[PDB]
Amino acid sequence: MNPPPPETSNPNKPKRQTNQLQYLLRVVLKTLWKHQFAWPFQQPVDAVKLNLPDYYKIIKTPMDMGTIKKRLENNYYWNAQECIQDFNTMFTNCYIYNKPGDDIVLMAEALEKLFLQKINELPTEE
Numbered sequence: 001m002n003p004p005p006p007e008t009s010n011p012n013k014p015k016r017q018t019n020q021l022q023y024l025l026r027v028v029l030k031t032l033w034k035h036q037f038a039w040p041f042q043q044p045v046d047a048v049k050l051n052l053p054d055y056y057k058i059i060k061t062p063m064d065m066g067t068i069k070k071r072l073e074n075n076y077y078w079n080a081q082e083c084i085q086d087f088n089t090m091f092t093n094c095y096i097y098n099k100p101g102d103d104i105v106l107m108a109e110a111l112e113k114l115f116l117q118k119i120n121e122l123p124t125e126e
């Protein structure tokens with residue numbers, strides 16, 4: 001079975017709309033989403049569909065860009081570090097679960113290199 005997906009809505013969680021979070025949606029997410037290697041990362045790992053009965057035995061902090069997109073679009077975050085953590089979690093999960101040099105790892109590595117360059121350019125808070 002798949003787990004419930006990560007939370008994307010919680011009215012009890014205080015929220016901010018900030019220029020750094022706006023950058024994360026408008027620049028970081030947009031650049032990553034349209035990348036040729038993005039599709040495996042655009043939704044939670046569907047362990048049923050992929051016949052990976054062990055995925056959620058190994059990965060206990062799942063994350064994906066579909067979830068990040070929802071979090072950004074629905075103003076889930078307080079700060080940019082929260083969002084950056086979600087991207088990092090997504091990449092780390094892929095590296096933990098998969099063999100080095102697997103296609104999925106090569107794809108994650110490509111996205112991560114692009115991610116790091118965009119994050120290095122994160123604007124100062126207004």
Ligand SMILES: CCc1c(C(=O)Nc2cccc(OCC(N)=O)c2)[nH]c(C)c1C(C)=O
Nearest residue numbers: 039040041042043045050093094097098104
């Ligand atoms: C290698 C299996 C794997 C995928 C993958 O194949 N995803 C996928 C599969 C079907 C459709 C889809 O999305 C369809 C869409 N983008 O609409 C995405 N993604 C990750 C992160 C991993 C692992 C194990 O780390």
